[PDB]
Each structure stands twice: as C-alpha cells, then as structure tokens.
Design a protein around this ligand. Sequence first.
Ligand code: MG
Ligand code: MG
Ligand code: MG
Ligand code: MG
Ligand code: MG
Ligand code: MG
Ligand code: MG
Ligand code: MG
Ligand code: MG
Ligand code: MG
Ligand code: MG
Ligand code: MG
Ligand code: MG
Ligand code: MG
Ligand code: MG
Ligand code: MG
Ligand code: MG
Ligand code: MG
Ligand code: MG
Ligand code: MG
Ligand code: MG
Lengths: 260, 182, 167, 134
Amino acid sequence: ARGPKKHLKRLAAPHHWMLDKLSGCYAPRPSAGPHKLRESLPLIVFLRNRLKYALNGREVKAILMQRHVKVDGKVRTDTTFPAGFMDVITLEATNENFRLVYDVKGRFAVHRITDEEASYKLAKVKKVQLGKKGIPYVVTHDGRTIRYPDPNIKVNDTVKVDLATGTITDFIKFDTGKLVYVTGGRNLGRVGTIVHRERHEGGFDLVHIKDSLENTFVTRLNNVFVIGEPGRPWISLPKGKGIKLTISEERDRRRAQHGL
Amino acid sequence: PRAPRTYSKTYSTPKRPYESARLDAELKLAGEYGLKNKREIYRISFQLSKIRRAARDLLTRDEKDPKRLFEGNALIRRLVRIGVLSEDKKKLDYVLALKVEDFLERRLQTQVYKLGLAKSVHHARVLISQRHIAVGKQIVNIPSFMVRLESEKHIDFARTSPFGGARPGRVARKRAAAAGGE
Amino acid sequence: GFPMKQGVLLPTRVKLLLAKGHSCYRPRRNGERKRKSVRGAIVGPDLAVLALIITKKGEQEIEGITNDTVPKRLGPKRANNIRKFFGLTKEDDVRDYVIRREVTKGDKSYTKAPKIQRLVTPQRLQRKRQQKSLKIKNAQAQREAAAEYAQLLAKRLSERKAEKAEV
Amino acid sequence: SDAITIRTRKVISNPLLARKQFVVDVLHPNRANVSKDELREKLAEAYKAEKDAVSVFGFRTQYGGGKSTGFGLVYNSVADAKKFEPAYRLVRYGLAEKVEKASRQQRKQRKNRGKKIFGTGKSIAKKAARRNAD
RNA sequence: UUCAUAAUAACUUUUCGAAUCGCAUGGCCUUGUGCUGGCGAUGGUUCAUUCAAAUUUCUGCCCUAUCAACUUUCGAUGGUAGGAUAGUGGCCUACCAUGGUUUCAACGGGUAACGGGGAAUAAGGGUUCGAUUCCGGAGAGGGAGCCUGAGAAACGGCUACCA
RNA sequence: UAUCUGGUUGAUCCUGCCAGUAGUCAUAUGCUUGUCUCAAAGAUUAAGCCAUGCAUGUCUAAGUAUAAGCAAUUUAUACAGUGAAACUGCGAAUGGCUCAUUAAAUCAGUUAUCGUUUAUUUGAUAGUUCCUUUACUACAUGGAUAUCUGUGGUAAUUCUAGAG
Ligand SMILES: [Mg+2]
Ligand SMILES: [Mg+2]
Ligand SMILES: [Mg+2]
Ligand SMILES: [Mg+2]
Ligand SMILES: [Mg+2]
Ligand SMILES: [Mg+2]
Ligand SMILES: [Mg+2]
Ligand SMILES: [Mg+2]
Ligand SMILES: [Mg+2]
Ligand SMILES: [Mg+2]
Ligand SMILES: [Mg+2]
Ligand SMILES: [Mg+2]
Ligand SMILES: [Mg+2]
Ligand SMILES: [Mg+2]
Ligand SMILES: [Mg+2]
Ligand SMILES: [Mg+2]
Ligand SMILES: [Mg+2]
Ligand SMILES: [Mg+2]
Ligand SMILES: [Mg+2]
Ligand SMILES: [Mg+2]
Ligand SMILES: [Mg+2]
C-alpha cells in the first residue's frame, strides 16, 4: 500500500536483535544501507542492547553525534545504520574494535578484535561483470563494487578488502576442502569445511559441510561464506569456534565449568 | 498495538461438581494444611497434572532417546530441588506416582509448622500473612511459597517485627505507653 | 470580494480551475488545483474597485501622489545588479558602493549592509581551483588503474600461451 | 545502627559519554528509604568526583525493607554531566532550571492559529483596524 | 539469451558533464598578493546495492444442484501486427481462427465471509471460532476522475455527480 | 488427566431423544465486592450521522536575512551573534483506524522478473562541454518573484487584487 514502509513493529523485528517483547511498541527499522534488513544489525541495537554503553535511544544518538563510532573506517551518524556480517565497528575512545560475526546459536556476537585485523574487511562475491567502457567490476555480497578485480575472482569467492582504501589485497577461491562460515538458515553461525558441492542447474546449489567434530550438514550456496583453508581461517572466529553443541552437551558444559 | 501480555489459568475445576467422597477428601486435605479454598487444592492438582502430562509424553518416547534423556531429566531435577521427589526415586517413572499431598507438604505454610515457630498450621499461616517469617533474609508473605529444600535450612523469623527481635510494635507498644505515665 | 483575472473577457463572474503559475490563487500543496470563482477582464456597473496605473502626468496635481516620492527600501544584492545600479564597470570593486542602513536602539548607533551574493571571493576561487584539481587527479588515477589492468592481462595471456605448447 | 552500606555493582566505564555507569545496591537496616541526595553525596565521597557530577535514578526497595537497588552514573566533569544528562534529571538534581511552557494543548492551539495567517500579521492588524472603522 | 560489454551508422524541438555552501588558513618564492593546497556539506551520470514495486509459478478456501450447462453482438480462448504501459500480457485496437471451463462440480446463489499467524475445547481422531495487539489486503459517505511526486488513482490533496 | 446421571413402563431390557454436568482472551446481564499484580474495552446493530479542540510538519558551522526583530559588545564598513517571516529543499504515500466489499479474489507456503520501475542508501563513476587554433564573461551571466513597505476589495475562508 502506497510507497515504502517506514516503521517496524517490535514483534515483526528480526529475532536475533535479541529485542525484548515489552518496553515499547516499535523496533529500530534499519535504514536503506549496505546489508539486507533481516540480515543486518542496526547501530542502535549494537550500542544499547549489546555493549550497554547507552541506556536509551537519545544516549545512542548523542554517542553517534560526537563522531566516534566507525563502521568500516567510515564514520556514520545514523542510529538505524545497518551494519551486518563482517562489518568492523571501531570506537575511537575505549580503543576497542569489533567485527560483527555470528555465534554458534544464531545471533550477532560481541567479538572483540585487535587493530591488525580491524584494518581489513572480508567479503563474499555476489556478481562479476563488465561495466561501462568495458571496465570489469566485482560486487561484494556485503555492499561494495570494486573496479578492475583480479580476473580469476569469480562468484562465491571471498575477498580481503583492505578497507582503508577499499582495494582487494587477496582472495580465496570457492572450492572443496576450504573453511566455510554459514550466514543463513538454521545452520547460521556454524563453521565447516565443504565436503561436496551439489549443483541442480535450475534452482539452488546445495553445499555439504563437515565441521571439526565430523558432523555433516547441508545448506544453500547463497548462505555459505568462505573463510580460509581448513584449520586456518583468515579472521578470528568467536568463542566456541562456530561448532554447535547438542543441548545436553551444552548443559553439561555449563555444569562442569561452574565457577561462581 | 503494543505486544500482548500472556495470561494462564493456573487451576482446573472438577469435571463433576458434587462427587461426595471427593468433596470430603478435599475438605480433609484443607483441614490438614489450613487451606483457604478448594481453589488452592485445585491449583495443586492442576500443577500435578501438568507434570504428569510431561512425564507420560516422555515415557511414550523411547528410553535413551535424546528428548526424553534431556527434558525428563530436567523435570526430575526440578522435582528433587523442590523436595517433592526423594533421592531414592530420580527415575521419571516415579514422577507419575507423586499425588497431591507431596506438594502441600512443601508449602511455606506446612514447612513453617514442621520446624517449630508455629503451634498448628493456622497459626503458621497467620504469621506468614502477617509479614513474620523470612527465608534468605527476605520476608515472605506467601503461604503457598514452595520451599526449595536447600532454602528450608534458613526459614526463620524476620529481623523486622517482634518474635525475631526488634521493636514490639502496635499493641505491646501501646501497653508500654499506658504503663509509662501511671 | 472577487478579483479580476486578466484574460477572461466577459462582463460577469465565472468559475475557473486554478493552478500554480496564474493569479487569483495561492497553492498550499504542490500541484493543488482549486476551482475558484473570479470576475472577468471587462469593467461593468458591478465593480467596487478599479486599479489604475497612471502612466502620463498631467497639468494639475493630486496632493500626495505626483508631488511626493516614496524611497526604494532595498538596494541591489547581487554584485552585477549593484554595478548596473551605479553604472560602475567590471574593474571597480563592489564592496564600497553597498547601501548602508542606520539603525539606533536609542543609544547604540548601528549599521546594516547586505551580503553581496555572486561576489568574487578568494574562497570561491580556491574552491574552483580545488574542483579543477580533483577531477584531473581522479582521471589520472583511473588511467593508471587501466594501465595496470592491461599489464596484468598481458602477463596472464603470456602465461596461458606458455602451457599452450606441449604434446 | 544506621549503617547505610552502599555498593556499586556492575561497573561499566564509559569514555564515549565520559562517565562510569553502575547498579547501586544500598543497605538500609532499620531505616526506611535512603533519599537520592544523600546517596549522591555518598557516591561523590567514594569516587572523589564532585556531587554535581553524580547522578542516581530508578530505585526500588527489596520488599520487607533492608535493601534498595537502583542505577547510578558518575560523569568525569560537571560540564560533562551538564551536556549528556537528560534535562529533567538535571532539574531534579538542582543544576539546570525548569523550562516554562504552557500546557501542550495551548501550544497546539497557538500553532493552529499561526497556520491560519500567511506572513507576519502586521498588515492584517492594520486591515482589521481601518476596515473595522469603515 | 538478440546477456554484460564493445564496435561501425546516423539521429535528437541535444539529457548530463558543479557559475553551490561551512570551517580550516597550511606549502614554494619566479616577493606577486602570485601560484597553490586540508577537512567537509549539498548537488549530479550511469551502474551497484538497499528500502521497496508491480506483476508471476505451483498447491490449498465455507454452505448450496429447490444453480447443469457456462463464456463468445459490447474479448470469450488462441494467432498476427500495432497501440498503450515502468515493463509482460485481449491490457486495448485491426484482421483472422473457434476456441476456453465443466458431474474430479464449471457457472449461478448465499455468507449474520476480510485471508493467515492463531483461539476455545482437549485420550486418539476431531468440532467450532479468528471484527481485534503481528503479517498480508482492501476503504476513508457513495461512485468516478486526476494533480504533485521516487511512490497516491491519496481523501486530516484537488475536480465533478449522487446522498 | 479415555467417567456419565434424571425422564417412555405395573415392572423389564432397548432404540432414542430431552434434561442435567464441565469449559469458553464468549458476549450480555443480576446480585454482591477489602487488598496485590496484569490489564481487554462502540467489532457484532448503523462502512449510521457528526457539535468543539487536537492528530504533520520541519534549519544545521554548512541553500536564501537590510524584520525598520532581539541583540550589545571590545571580527565586519560586503556580510559574519542570535533570529520571526517567506522562498527553496524535504516530508506529508509512514503511522493510526476500520472490516464494507471480496469465495480462485484476498491470503498462506512456494517460485519467477532472461518481464519491469525504484526518492533515499552504500559502493562506483565523467581531462574530450571547444569546433579551426593572431586579440576571448569565466577573478564568475541574465531577468524575475516571495516575504517586507504601502493601496485596497468582500457579511464572510487558512479569499488575494494593485503598486514599490
Ligand atoms: Mg536463476
Ligand atoms: Mg513491618
Ligand atoms: Mg552564494
Ligand atoms: Mg543489448
Ligand atoms: Mg504484442
Ligand atoms: Mg462482510
Ligand atoms: Mg473466517
Ligand atoms: Mg482476522
Ligand atoms: Mg462485521
Ligand atoms: Mg462515516
Ligand atoms: Mg479517494
Ligand atoms: Mg479525518
Ligand atoms: Mg490518511
Ligand atoms: Mg470422545
Ligand atoms: Mg410407549
Ligand atoms: Mg410411571
Ligand atoms: Mg444439554
Ligand atoms: Mg498496602
Ligand atoms: Mg460501528
Ligand atoms: Mg515550504
Ligand atoms: Mg498504513
């Protein structure tokens, strides 16, 4: 009905916002940005509901204004700016750097990171095409277009963007026996190896993934994000190395590592 | 258009109103544990029934099957914590055999009575309502509080009120005042 | 009340659909089109007022209209406009010939002067220069990138045509 | 005994708002309700920072007395406190002073009235005068 | 894929290619006030993307045969070409063909029918309800028609008629 | 959380219903009604009609101030502090309400756009505007129009004419 929608009801929000059912009718709708609405994570949520540096929206706004938050080197001032997967959130005071990565369960984890890694962003390849004047460009599944790419970078390949300038420093080819991260579905937040790649030339390629504990699962190709060569990831993965325990196992862990 | 609040009816009425034997049993139960209503009894029954439903379901699933192993185990643990199941009977099969008395013999009412502090159940109830009796230095107003077995060691009078040693208050104070200038 | 719209002809009032551009109407939303009643361009026996612009002065005078003058309130704001008004030419500077207004609170004597718009500042010039530089720089960068790409292409083609030998 | 054992639990140091934020847990014994001002003073004494650079809000008594739990922030300077703290809180404290608006309804009405005139209504006034006269 | 893209042919009542703003006041002397240069705002081209958008595939709706034939002059089903549209298409127009749906209920009638998530009940199977907090969809007394705009056939916009 | 009981007879066994029994984020209503927490609430009939008030406006170092506004005082003889108005920009297509229409329609899950439009967004990005190349606006082009100042029209309206 008539043009774009501008609000978001609290229940209609992505569940991995971890937003509480009460204390409001509305949720912070991610503005038009680099990442998809449902796959994003607004700055407000990151600030208030994760790190707890702000108490309310006004506080968040104030924080933003003094030009201190930095999403991928660039500044940002939107409360509802949609930082998503692999995005580096740097705070100038505190000197903390964060990379937005998922965890074993599904939601965005607070993952503290060093300045040596915070310099670069890792990004999947969505499209490879020749643009105007015959100039080749690559499209990252995370927002960007990069002109004149290395011509053996194809779709689904992951790319090390140096972020400070925005040039491709290095890349990983999508292939069997390469460390992978799942970014959508039930298996989202899981880390694996790629055992096999089914095709079905028509609709949705399925990739078979084994983790470190020899525990195979299948996801769609567009949910699968390459991260390195097995055992050696290009980024630091969060605590619990994207592993997925069974519920009982988790409970046991909780019990046996008690230290109140 | 704010997110709806969840209610749950916590008791269930009997399916046949004037079953005389049943009524008498209920009355007896009330007498035993100083219950204000049949409603309290019904609540307890409902609670029991919920547990039973869970247990039966678990049983229906294969033994050593994940869900049974987990959820059932958790339930058992909870029961033991509350103090309704005994350490002999951490079994899930024994969960079905529980019966209403074990829940009533675990209220902050009955517990209070059974540790001294009272002289009959009614007295205990009165004390509870009257803001005497604390658990972990926390004054409990609720007669049907379900004492958590490990907290059962700590049931005492409050640091406020008399009985547990503070200012006498109200009637005693008045009496003292009267005595004073006479 | 009704005004006279220029163009209607007709000795009587008529209803018209009126938009932005033409008179007898001020639009309150963009592209609002009120149907309003308006009197014609022909003068009749029914008008309350004529509006008359006197173009040729005559033999006698009318008290306070032909003898008397009302001062023009605002001097020109654009630099070229200012130049025109005085008749100054391009090399004479505008700043000095800006009309001042004297305002007093009662004690404090104070002067008001307009910001000359479309004036040749150093700042403006600097900005222009920067703009000129920037585009050129960008172009150069692009060229460099293109060259690099070409080189890369050449030294992959060569590689390809080394394994193109064999049995 | 009055005691008033004050505790700062869950201490987040926040350079982004130039503050330290924490859960205030205060003990009563035999005394009902601590009062905000007193708490603030205590906090100031603890933290060496000025009394006006301290802010405490959102308290609840434990039930059956004995304790009060609330939320506390201690800013680096008074200036910082002034420029980050909500206005109402400041007013409560005694730093900033009450803004004197009319009831919102009145304001709304005024706005509506204003809407009904195009430009500043001095000409309109004149028209009303002269036209009224004749 | 007649794709991306490039190339030759020309065309065009020739679109765009910064006559725009704030704070900085830095670097070489050919010692001019010269040439320069920093961080930003707004803009602007096509391609991205994002928030969207129109359509669109397959499968699924409650009673009724005291509705068995329905659609096709006035488009019904298909073809061809055009027009129109943001674009696909009987969407509309011209010429042509005679199809399309149906007892595995078409069509018609009713609904005290908005659809769904769900709700009440509660052995298993079911039965009834869902105006209503979330998601779709409609509508602003009724019907039309449009302006502005990225987006409305908008009604706390306009134009008309009826009430 | 698998339950039935009263009524066809002089009595009997049935078929069968009626009656009871229990629940209802199911409405109404009758009596009563101390406390705590939570909180539906002009849907059902009339998508019937509406007094009055309010519900969409908006300005930053950073588009346009000669308010004849306030400042007033130790950046202005171009402006430069705040700043009503008005122009411009943007928004008013979201939200909120309601369920009248609507039965392969809507809608649900599922596809598709190699069939299109998309402000904004975040990336990208344009030495080629010239047109013969011995003396040319580019150290910057043109005319308006708002507010304002004045002259009014009308019983009247968020009606606007005439001049500067
Ligand atoms: Mg495809
Ligand atoms: Mg007391
Ligand atoms: Mg200018
Ligand atoms: Mg093509
Ligand atoms: Mg065609
Ligand atoms: Mg209906
Ligand atoms: Mg229904
Ligand atoms: Mg519904
Ligand atoms: Mg209805
Ligand atoms: Mg109505
Ligand atoms: Mg309408
Ligand atoms: Mg209205
Ligand atoms: Mg509306
Ligand atoms: Mg049955
Ligand atoms: Mg008989
Ligand atoms: Mg008889
Ligand atoms: Mg019955
Ligand atoms: Mg009380
Ligand atoms: Mg109604
Ligand atoms: Mg405007
Ligand atoms: Mg809406």
